[PDB]
């Protein structure tokens, strides 16, 4: 039956080399753009994305982009006519099978490079069943594991031949396939991978098949930690997903530079061709190369998409936004309509994920650009050619329908129903992969992740608008749960998040209280609490931002005991900070980043010093800000402050007040020097009235509780039990232990209101109210009869720009230095227990390093501060950044650090230098906004440079919270360091400089400290 196969191999080849020359003309067309837009060796950044909206526009509006639609449907029929004639091609049984080998191997180049993956692996698997190629069953074994086909590898692994180079690599998936199947093998097969992960990195040979399995094994143990950890799995560590998916997108990146130098993600020198068409000095008639350049290009995009989609959901807001962009330019250098669009929507999806990051402009250029890519005549005859045929693309189109609709309820109902079409429409290519009509194919693993990304984005919009009324919302969700569950591993970022988003949907617990004031069944309650107690106990090592911030803030919102709350609140925050620490330690475990349950959590809080309390405030899962005050002697006090809408009206009015600072400083124009200081003095004097309004309207009575809590006297500790025992269960003991402690500081009618505010949540008593002011009169008698404490603030980064340290409570009280994370304090505290440093850090400033005004553009401020250094004997460079090797030597050897230059860590100390060297140097960062966290979405913990220092274990960070005049911030620094020596610690030294500051709150409250306090070494 050569009479039609010899015609068809001529027909398939002229389709593929028709296509491979067609998309070669597209990827030299953008090569005319990438010099014009970027440069022959130009730089790319986060603001190179506005450029990449132009290239995708001139990519679609080129004459060649619609021309590939005919090559798509032609090779589709060449797949349908092949599987009819596949029987006769197998029955040839000659060496003319070798010239028949290039019938699917040409198509194996087609569907992999186009990303049509369900149709790609089946003709590849047929190429194995026809030709039995050695270097192609290396590739065909990766994609069957990549699609999560558990049953299908079980058959094909026995039939094939495993040679010397192959048996190391077939054993790699065998350890991963027996991993997810059997719960008892998850301990055994993990060490078999953790040996094999380090076996391949140890081998120094630069074989292409060795680097083909260097990326793949580092992908297998990437998704390894997605399992529920039991009693057998706590004592064995896991490999972390975030760390070496960047190494599995590094080794796959090295595979491309050998074959095609342009389609590498690391290659920024876009002068190279990225042209598939020559095929490296030959291989125009070679069959096993078109798989070998087909799969390895497709494996590079399937990792760089996976390295991007892992970092949208592990709160790496830095490592995503870089790896989102250079995902897309390599897609544009490949010019595939699918590979561009599966990155184009995610840049419009990620900009819909993070908000208030300056990215309102970033979404509106990119949300339009995917719609600009779809519809005809860019700024239904091309997109509707590939929409029914390609299964993964048909999810991407309706994904871009959801992003264009901004994830409405009816759009998910448009996408829940259409998903049932695409799985039924694309079932045919999935069934022919199995060669069995009995088995049922699960959906495409790209398609399940797209449906996972889409509903999770919608369910957060439900919880942002706070409704669950319709029954069809359940029917969408109950469909949406089954769709994600087909792989219990490898997509658990989409599994665990949608359960809790659906659990919180049924059970909001909005807890309408008296003092909230939003402006502008118990058997059912327990059937989920038994799950979440286990879903806390299991899945502790996860650290995925959508699951973690929605679970642990919810169980902190609903728990009865207070110790279960403070473990839940502390673990729920700062997901982006801990994952870089996780990727630093390159191995994740139950208890080295997260805390091992409540019983290990309350161990360190008792081990926290008596002067150090840490008043956390934090947003919940439902956006409502709760206060979590921890201390050693007391139980943690947890109390709802207000709603999101109260804190939005807080942060809208404050930033609009702070914009009045910025517009005067950026644009003075020609204002006379008196009216300069005069006009914003009332705006400063507004902040004199504003934080009084914040203490009255936002925090209310609860603001008196932000004072630090010392140890209660044992004669006075008898009353705090009698306050508990007479409360009849209204207060707990640790809550009432500090109400007798804080009773001296606050008013009578305030103290009567706050302990009644505790009773509002748990069974208030009428008889207790009649005997209530006698408790205050007894409390004064016991507190007077029975140093330098601190009240550390761990602010949720929605509220972190506000000067929480400057309040009407803390006018007389100066010791109000702030923090970053509760678990970051404990690593900062244990480092001062390993080093055995004093809990205020003695610092010899006379050696301390400085960086002063790089690039000579600052002005007299460069000459002003150096006059203060002429007093001292510091070491450092002026007018330049010396070298990053001396910056790492500065923060390691010199005891303190001083930065007066532009911003914070832009050129003089980027993220490259803080990761290589740990810092004992207390860093003094000046600038406008040197510790300002730009308030990203819930869970991301903001966009700032502090989390670099938080990962680098710097002890204390002196920073600035907004745009400040360069003169008075340099009059601040000379007045502050002088106070340290000529004890009077740094949080006192800041408050004394407020007496010397010209402005009260609009300038002096810009400076907050983050860390353990500075005392001067004598």
């Amino acid at each position: 039956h050569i009479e039609k196969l010899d015609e068809l191999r001529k027909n398939v080849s002229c389709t593929v080399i028709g296509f491979a020359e067609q998309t070669a003309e597209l990827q030299q067309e953008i090569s005319e753009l990438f010099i014009a837009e970027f440069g022959v060796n130009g730089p790319i950044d986060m603001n190179s994305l506005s450029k990449l909206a132009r290239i995708t526009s001139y990519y679609a509006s080129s004459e060649y982009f619609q021309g590939l639609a005919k090559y798509q449907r032609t090779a589709c029929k060449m797949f349908i006519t092949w599987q009819t004639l596949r029987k006769e091609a197998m029955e040839c049984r000659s060496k003319d099978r070798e010239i028949f080998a290039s019938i699917p191997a040409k198509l194996c180049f087609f569907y992999f490079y186009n990303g049509e993956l369900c149709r790609a692996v089946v003709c590849l698997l047929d190429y194995i069943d026809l030709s039995d190629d050695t270097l192609a069953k290396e590739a065909a074994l990766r994609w069957l594991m990549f699609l999560g086909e558990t049953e299908l590898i079980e058959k094909k692994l026995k039939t094939w031949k495993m040679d010397k180079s192959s048996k190391d690599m077939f054993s790699a998936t065998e350890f991963a396939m027996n991993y997810l199947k059997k719960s008892e093998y998850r301990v055994e097969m993990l060490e078999k991978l953790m040996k094999l992960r380090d076996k391949v990195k140890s081998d120094p040979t630069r074989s292409f098949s060795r680097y083909e399995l260097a990326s793949y094994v580092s992908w297998l143990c990437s998704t390894l930690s997605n399992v529920p950890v039991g009693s057998a799995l706590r004592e064995c560590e896991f490999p972390d997903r975030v760390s070496h998916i960047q190494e599995a997108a590094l080794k796959s990146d090295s595979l491309v530079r050998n074959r095609i130098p342009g389609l590498a993600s690391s290659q920024f020198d876009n002068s190279v061709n990225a042209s598939i068409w020559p095929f490296l000095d030959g291989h125009q008639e070679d069959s096993n190369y078109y798989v070998h350049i087909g799969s390895t290009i497709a494996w590079h995009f399937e990792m760089r998409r996976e390295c991007a989609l892992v970092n949208v959901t592990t709160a790496q807001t830095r490592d995503s936004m870089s790896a989102m962009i250079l995902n897309l330019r390599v897609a544009l250098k490949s010019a595939s309509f699918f590979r561009v669009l599966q990155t184009t929507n995610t840049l419009a999806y990620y900009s819909s994920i993070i908000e208030e990051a300056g990215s309102e402009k970033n979404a509106k250029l990119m949300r339009v650009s995917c719609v600009n890519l779809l519809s005809s005549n860019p700024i239904v005859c091309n997109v509707c050619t590939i929409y029914p045929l390609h299964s993964s693309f048909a999810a991407e189109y309706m994904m871009s329908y959801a992003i264009h609709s901004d994830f409405s309820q009816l759009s998910i109902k448009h996408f829940n129903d259409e998903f049932a079409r695409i799985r039924e429409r694309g079932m045919s290519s999935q069934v022919l992969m199995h060669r069995d009509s009995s088995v049922r194919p699960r959906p495409n693993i790209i398609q399940n992740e797209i449906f996972g990304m889409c509903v999770i984005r919608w369910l957060t919009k439900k919880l942002d608008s706070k409704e669950s009324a319709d029954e069809d919302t359940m029917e969408i969700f109950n469909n949406a749960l089954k769709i994600v569950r087909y792989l219990q591993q490898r997509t658990t970022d989409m599994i665990l998040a949608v359960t809790q988003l659906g659990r919180q949907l049924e059970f909001p617990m909005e807890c309408n209280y008296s003092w909230m004031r939003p402006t502008i069944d118990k058997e059912r309650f327990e059937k989920v609490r038994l799950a979440m107690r286990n879903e806390m106990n299991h899945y502790g090592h996860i650290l995925y931002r959508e699951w973690r911030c929605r679970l642990f803030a919810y169980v902190g919102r609903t728990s009865r005991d207070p110790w279960e709350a403070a473990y839940a609140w502390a673990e729920s925050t700062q997901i982006g900070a801990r994952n870089a620490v996780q990727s630093r330690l390159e191995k994740c475990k139950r208890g080295l980043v997260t805390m091992s349950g409540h019983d290990r959590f309350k161990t360190c809080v008792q081990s926290m010093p008596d002067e150090m309390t840490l008043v956390q405030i934090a947003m919940a899962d439902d956006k409502t800000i709760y206060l979590v005050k921890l201390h050693a002697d007391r139980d943690p006090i947890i109390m709802p402050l207000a709603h999101y809408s109260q804190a939005v009206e807080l942060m809208d009015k404050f930033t609009f007040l702070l914009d009045e600072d910025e517009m005067i400083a950026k644009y003075p124009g020609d204002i006379t020097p008196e009216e300069f200081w005069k006009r914003r003095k009332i705006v400063d004097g507004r902040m004199m009235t504003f934080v009084d309004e914040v203490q009255k309207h936002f925090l209310g009575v609860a603001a008196s509780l932000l004072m630090p809590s010392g140890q209660l006297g044992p004669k006075a500790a008898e009353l705090a039990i009698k306050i508990h025992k007479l409360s009849k269960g209204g207060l707990l003991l640790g809550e009432a232990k500090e109400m007798v402690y804080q009773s001296k500081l606050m008013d009578a009618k305030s103290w009567e209101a706050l302990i009644l505010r505790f009773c509002e949540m748990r069974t208030t008593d009428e008889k207790f109210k009649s005997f209530l002011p006698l408790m205050h009169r007894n409390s004064v008698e016991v507190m007077n009869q029975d140093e330098k404490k601190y009240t550390y603030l761990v602010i949720c980064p929605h509220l972190s720009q506000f000067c929480w340290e400057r309040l009407p409570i803390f006018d007389e009280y100066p010791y109000v230095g702030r923090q970053v994370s509760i678990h970051s304090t404990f690593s900062q505290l244990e480092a001062m227990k390993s080093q055995e440093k004093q809990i205020p850090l003695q610092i010899d400033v006379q050696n301390a390093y400085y960086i002063l005004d790089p690039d000579n553009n600052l002005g007299e401020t460069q000459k002003r501060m150096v006059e203060y250094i002429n007093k001292f004997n510091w070491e450092g460079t002026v007018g330049s950044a010396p070298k990053s090797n001396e910056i790492s030597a500065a923060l390691s050897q010199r005891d303190a650090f001083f930065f007066i230059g532009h911003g914070s860590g832009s050129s003089v100390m980027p993220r490259s230098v803080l990761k290589q060297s740990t810092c004992n140097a207390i860093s003094l960062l000046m600038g406008c906004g040197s510790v300002r966290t730009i308030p990203q979405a819930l869970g991301f913990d903001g966009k700032t440079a502090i989390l670099d220092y938080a990962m680098a274990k710097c002890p204390l960070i002196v920073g600035c919270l907004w745009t400040v005049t360069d003169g008075e911030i340099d009059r601040f620094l000379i007045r502050m360091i002088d106070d340290c020596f000529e004890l009077r610690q740094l949080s006192e030294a800041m408050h004394e400089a407020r007496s010397k500051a010209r402005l009260k709150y609009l300038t002096g409250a810009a400076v907050v400290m983050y860390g353990l306090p500075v005392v001067a070494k004598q």
């Binding site: 950044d45 292409f208 060795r210 590094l250 993600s265 029914p388 002005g859 914070s904």
Partner: protein
């Protein structure tokens, strides 16, 4: 009274609004050999060139989005 008006030392970074990421997201000078087993000889026939390849593609219109309907029929 008041002091003379002052300029502000603002940041051009704007806290990771720009980040010129460097080329080392991967190892450098990593030229590698193929190390392939099956490298058998090809065939030699008359090639359908860039003018002749569109001639074979012109005869195949290949349906109007109904090739997936012909897929499950086999």
């Amino acid at each position: 009274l008041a002091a003379d008006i002052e300029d502000d030392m603002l940041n051009l970074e704007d806290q990771d609004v720009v980040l010129s990421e460097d080329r080392p997201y991967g190892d450098v000078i990593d030229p590698a050999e193929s190390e392939a087993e099956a490298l058998a000889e090809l065939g030699v026939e008359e090639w359908d060139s860039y003018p002749p390849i569109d001639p074979a593609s012109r005869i195949g219109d290949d349906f109007n989005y109904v090739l997936r309907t012909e897929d499950f029929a086999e």
